[PDB]
């Protein structure tokens, strides 16, 4: 789980003393640039077509 | 008194009473009092309506300036109990007179409506437009100053 968190696979933290993993609260995807990037790839492909 | 209802500030009911009630309700021999706030039943009802107008003006002013306010502070500024102030605010909100969301668990009143991205970006665009207009006007003023001192 530590390797997964470091690599960015999952956004979380590990409480070693407590012995569990707390997953980070999900961030609003549509309020970030990721939809813009996906739309960018798709738009460029459509214009290329 | 009319100026008190025109100024864009808070007015306190206790101060209003101690400064004008005798001149309005009982009046003076030099300046007789009208039957507007007389000792009759209609006078009492109009006095209660005057208090309602005072507290509603205070709520309007507090909505213009405050963005969030404590229910305790709202009650203190309205010369009302927490329950009375909350009931009056609820009546105003239901009638669509004033927008306010009451987080009663935390005792918080939010006068700030949720910000539509349209609204936020439109405020930004209006700021840009005003900035550009002011830049143009400053350039013209600079041209006048160059003319005067050349």
């Amino acid at each position: 789980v530590a390797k997964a968190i470091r690599d960015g696979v999952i956004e979380a933290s590990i409480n070693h003393e407590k012995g569990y993993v707390q997953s980070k609260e999900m961030i609003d995807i549509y309020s970030t640039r990721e939809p813009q990037l996906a739309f960018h790839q798709r738009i460029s492909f459509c214009l290329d077509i | 008194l009319l100026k008190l209802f025109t100024t864009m500030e808070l007015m306190r009911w206790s101060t209003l009473v101690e400064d004008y009630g005798m001149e309005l309700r009982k009046g003076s021999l030099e300046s007789p009092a009208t039957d507007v706030f007389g000792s009759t039943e209609e006078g009492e009802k109009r006095w209660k309506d005057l208090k309602n107008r005072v507290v509603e003006h205070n709520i309007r002013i507090m909505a213009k300036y405050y963005t969030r306010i404590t229910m305790k502070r709202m009650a203190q500024l309205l010369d009302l109990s927490v329950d009375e102030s909350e009931a009056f605010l609820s009546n105003l909100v239901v009638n669509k007179t004033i927008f306010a969301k009451v987080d009663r668990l935390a005792g918080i009143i939010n006068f700030q409506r949720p910000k539509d991205p349209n609204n936020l970006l439109n405020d930004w665009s209006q700021k840009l437009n005003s900035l550009m207009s002011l830049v143009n006007k400053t350039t013209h003023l600079i041209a006048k100053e160059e003319m005067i001192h050349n």
């Binding site: - | 864009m8 808070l10 002013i61 405050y66 969030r68 306010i69 404590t70 502070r73 918080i108």
Partner: protein
């Protein structure tokens, strides 16, 4: 005095600077908001004042020099972005 990024004045700051009690601070802001001296809002829950505008005041020559330096940075940014747009869209520019 505070820069535009840090124009959130705590109630304690105004109370200490104006030699007034904390519970009066709000009323003071009211006057400054009613007259038109300053613009903004009051977050009484957090005991803060979000000030967004000030009455423009007479500035010293050094303050004018600092303002001109701000204009220098602004001009640099505008020129850089203008050149970027001209270079990127050179083929389609009329």
């Amino acid at each position: 005095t505070r820069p535009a990024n840090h124009r959130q004045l705590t109630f304690e700051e105004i109370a200490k600077s104006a030699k007034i009690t904390v519970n009066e601070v709000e009323l003071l802001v009211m006057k400054a908001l009613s007259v038109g001296l300053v613009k903004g809002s009051i977050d009484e829950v957090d005991k803060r004042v979000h000030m967004t505008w000030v009455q423009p005041r007479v500035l010293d020559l050094q303050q004018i020099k600092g303002m001109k330096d701000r204009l220098e940075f602004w001009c640099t940014d505008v020129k850089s972005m203008e050149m970027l747009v001209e270079h990127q869209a050179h083929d389609i520019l009329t």
